[PDB]
A paper describes a structure:
Nitric oxide (NO) is an important signaling molecule critical in the cardiovascular, neuronal, and immune systems.
Compound 4 is a typical example, as shown in Figure 8, where the inhibitor can bind both to the active site and to the BH4 site in hnNOS, triggering backbone changes, but only one inhibitor binds to the active site in heNOS and does not induce backbone changes. Inhibitor binding in the BH4 site often requires a significant conformational rearrangement near the dimer interface to provide room for the second inhibitor molecules. This suggests that when two inhibitors bind, the first one enters the active site and hydrogen bonds with the active site Glu, lowering the energetic barrier to the conformational change required to bind the second molecule that displaces BH4.
Residue numbers in the entry:
A (entry chain A): 302 to 343, 349 to 722
B (entry chain B): 304 to 344, 353 to 722
Write the structure that this text describes.
């Protein structure tokens, strides 16, 4: 590996120099002969053995004491010794509160696919490592939602449940986000509600949930403590801030009956710090408008929102070259942004977010020596080339602490 | 080993074995991916013969005559020719095969379902810039075809010692000049400001309009390049108007019909063709008229939004996005109305998915660069957005080469 790699911005001609990639610890999936940059992800018995844990913990503790300008100190050496004794005698170790907070913020700071990382150091960390039951998890999650929502002035936050021990006592949130709408596949094939959530909805109903069978039924929480079987809980509806979607010019848009929830809280990823694995760690921020997945709702039978909007706009839907899909996609995204701003719910448009990210990326190159960034996920899903990330070259690599994918729990769980 | 790629809308999984036959580096490593870097990075007798062999082998394998009589005879003939001349010459059949397969292997090209329909013009006998101009005129006339555009490539003599290169200095056969105004705005096409100044310094007398077709600057056998004017009756153009906004035509915009890329290098069996202009037809989003100045301060993007009376105070109004869609509607509407071949990004990406399926079935895979295949607008409502791809470098190939004015020893 060469010591300095350059990235160029082809609009501004600015060149940045990356050295931070020398600190990457996980494989990308690419090789010198093949690039897997567009692959989305390139057993339970296995937890870190003692001998695998030692070097990962040292690397994290070193990095932590380096960041607080205490590298090589008495404090640093005593912590190393203390961690090594814990691993020696218990096969694991416990993070200090300060290291837990540092590790969670840097897992976000290192998330190469996240365009909102300019915010990385303003993360509220909730330590739920004292949790023991699904009821306790529900309590912790309700407080998280209430704190993060903050009556529409959203605050990014993470709640960290106990780390993995032997792999048979994992804490898991089975939801993919804390707030999602149910989806119901009808006998004739059409979809009621959110088609993205049909499978998990079926699991909840299988587990005993009584579905209202509407378009916007907030799913229950499915929570697993200490490897036990997961248990169902209803989020108090007053904790779920929602926004009705309307359009600033099209009076008929509201008649589509659409709304969306304010808080994106992803809960099916894994947080890795110093070799420790926090398999339940829901984190939340606020939305970028393009993320809001209302366009895939069915309006009726075979017409989704995108098509219905085009019909109501009276666009020519016969030929594709009329760009009716593009026109309707813009109007939907205009409606989303206008509705959140009107109700004073935090949201960011893709122009502002990518513009902030470029400034963040420059600051990180200057102050940190690099900024891992996954162009394939950073560029927004519409109007790519008119955002400043499109012509920005990026280097992708995996730093630790990190957020990682993990198997869906229903595939791996051993039912009691 | 075998590698799988999933489409997350259709859940189709394809299995890639063809990447195993790749031997040029991508730029990535196990620890750093350079998928968004635009370019991450003469032949001796010893280097040449294995490359020539590999290509001859795959050629005779493709015509199902591997290990045949004529196959063995060709390897011996090529080997002897490298030994005595330090290079070798491709047969016409091989030249056509190689050119089509360089297109087939262009991982960044969404239009490759057409790869086998390519008219190849052998210009390896050319000796002078005048001859290059002749070959290029014939290429343009054939490819334009009164608006029924036909894909084509013209291939000039291969590199020898590196001091006698043939080069087309233009980036495309047809482009508009760009004039940086002391004002501060740009007259004409801002993307061509540098080459425009090189043409002026070379003696071109600029008309200083908005749509001045640049002269050809042609370099034969390493000599200094020479200027030529393409006959205007050969340059097919389309006035840009809008099917609903009658004021769009008042922006006075137009574009040329023939995209013909002339600054890339074609590599076949170890031989290097530094002058090989290739042309097809446009995808509507490629047409970079949005970056024109309408006045001394506002973009076509800004001018369109202004005439649509959009709110341009805040980005969240998405005025840029709205105007961008309307400019692309007009481009497509204008080419179709004038019966000039064009493809929209929905049809093109849809065709590319079908191309991938074909290629995985018959070839074992298809190298594809997601970063370049996804169109520059409305990405997620095209079928390629959710299509996983594998990117790898197969030869024959089209390659980047430095601008000739940074390497040329002037005399
Ligand atoms: C504060 C406002 C935030 C915004 C606007 C934002 C924006 C985004 C967007 C637009 C994506 C890609 C979405 C997609 O492709 O569908 C993303 C991905 C991601 N975000 Fe952020 N994010 C925010 C906060 C956070 C926080 C607080 C965390 C964690 C502490 C986080 C961690 C991640 C990760 C790990 C990914 C990649 C997920 C994956 O690989 O599957 N984000 N973010
Ligand atoms: C026939 C219709 C064709 C269409 C619609 C088409 C479309 C495109 C598009 C949209 C791009 C990317 C454009 C950009 O990023 O600005 C591209 C790239 C490319 N095209 Fe095609 N193309 C066509 C024909 C051809 C032909 C005939 C050749 C050569 C024989 C070719 C070779 C290439 C190459 C080499 C690239 C990548 C350039 C690079 O690596 O820098 N294309 N094509
Ligand atoms: C905190 C936060 C705020 C926000 N506005 N967007 C976010 C988007 C993601 C995200 C985006 C894509 C994605 C996944 C998560 C899940 N992985 C595991 C599957 C692949 O797809 C995560 C967190 C977000
Ligand atoms: C290559 C690539 C780049 C990028 N930026 N995002 C991607 C997102 C997905 C994705 C994954 C799961 C998913 C959906 C999208 C949404 N729909 C289709 C419902 C099913 O859930 C797949 C590939 C992506
Ligand atoms: C034949 C044909 C038809 C068509 N419709 N589009 C095309 C686009 C390209 C192309 C696209 C992008 C690009 C470059 C060329 C030049 N390289 C050297 C720098 C990187 O940028 C090439 C050929 C095309
Ligand atoms: C990462 C990436 C992906 C992609 N799909 N396309 C890209 C195109 C360029 C590009 C490079 C040079 C250039 C222009 C575009 C055109 N304008 C900006 C005039 C100046 O020349 C750079 C990066 C790209
Ligand atoms: Zn890569």
């Amino acid at each position: 590996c060469p010591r300095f790699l350059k990235v160029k911005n082809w609009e501004t001609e600015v060149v940045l120099t990356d050295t931070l990639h020398l600190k990457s610890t996980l494989e990308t999936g690419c090789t010198e002969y093949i690039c897997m940059g567009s692959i989305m992800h390139p057993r339970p018995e296995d937890v870190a053995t003692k001998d695998q844990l030692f070097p990962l913990a040292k690397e994290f503790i070193d990095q932590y004491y380096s960041s607080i300008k205490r590298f090589g100190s008495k404090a640093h050496m005593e912590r190393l010794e203390e961690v090594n004794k814990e691993i020696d005698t218990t096969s694991t170790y416990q993070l200090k509160d300060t290291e837990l907070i540092y590790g969670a913020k840097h897992a976000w700071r290192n998330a190469s696919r996240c365009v909102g990382r300019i915010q990385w150091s303003k993360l509220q960390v909730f330590d739920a490592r004292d949790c023991t039951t699904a009821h306790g998890m529900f309590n912790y999650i309700c407080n998280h939602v209430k704190y993060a929502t903050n009556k529409g002035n959203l605050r990014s936050a993470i709640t960290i449940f106990p780390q993995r021990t032997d792999g048979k006592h994992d804490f898991r949130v089975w939801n993919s986000q804390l707030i999602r709408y149910a989806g119901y596949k009808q006998p004739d094939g059409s979809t009621l509600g959110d088609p993205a959530n049909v499978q998990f909805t079926e699991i909840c109903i299988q587990q005993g949930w009584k579905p209202p069978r509407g378009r916007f039924d907030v799913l229950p929480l499915l929570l697993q403590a200490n490897g036990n079987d997961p248990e169902l809980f209803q989020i108090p509806p007053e904790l779920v801030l929602e926004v009705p979607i309307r359009h600033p010019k099209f009076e008929w848009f509201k008649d589509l009956g659409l709304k969306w929830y304010g808080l994106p809280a992803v809960s099916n990823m894994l947080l890795e710090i110093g070799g420790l694995e926090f398999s339940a760690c829901p984190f939340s921020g606020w939305y970028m408008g393009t993320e809001i997945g209302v366009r895939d709702y069915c309006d009726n039978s075979r017409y989704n929102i995108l098509e219905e909007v085009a019909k109501k706009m009276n666009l020519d839907m016969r030929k594709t070259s009329s760009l009716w899909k593009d026109q309707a996609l813009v109007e939907i995204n205009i409606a989303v942004l206008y509705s959140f701003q009107s109700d004073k719910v935090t949201i960011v448009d893709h122009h502002s977010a990518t513009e902030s990210f470029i400034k963040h990326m420059e600051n990180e190159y200057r102050c940190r020596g690099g900024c891992p960034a996954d162009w394939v996920w950073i560029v927004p899903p519409m109007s790519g080339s008119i955002t400043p990330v499109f012509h920005q070259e990026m280097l992708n690599y995996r730093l630790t602490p990190s957020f990682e994918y993990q198997p869906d729990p229903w595939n791996t769980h051993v039912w009691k």
